[PDB]
Amino acid sequence: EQCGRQAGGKLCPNNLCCSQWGWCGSTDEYCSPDHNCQSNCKD
């Protein structure tokens, strides 16, 4: 995993959103509070 709880709090590179799964990306499944985004979220 790249980020988030699964990776002991690592932030994503390039301002990317950390999904609930601990991976980095820029679309809704990564960024939405409705999908429990962990960091750099779209709110």
Side-chain angles (χ1 to χ4, degrees), residues 20 28-38 41-42:
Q20 62 191 326
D28 189 71
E29 281 272 324
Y30 301 84
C31 298
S32 181
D34 297 337
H35 288 111
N36 308 123
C37 169
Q38 301 191 63
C41 305
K42 180 166 187 257

Side-chain angles (χ1 to χ4, degrees), residues 16-29:
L16 290 166
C17 306
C18 185
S19 77
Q20 62 191 326
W21 297 105
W23 301 100
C24 300
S26 57
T27 49
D28 189 71
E29 281 272 324

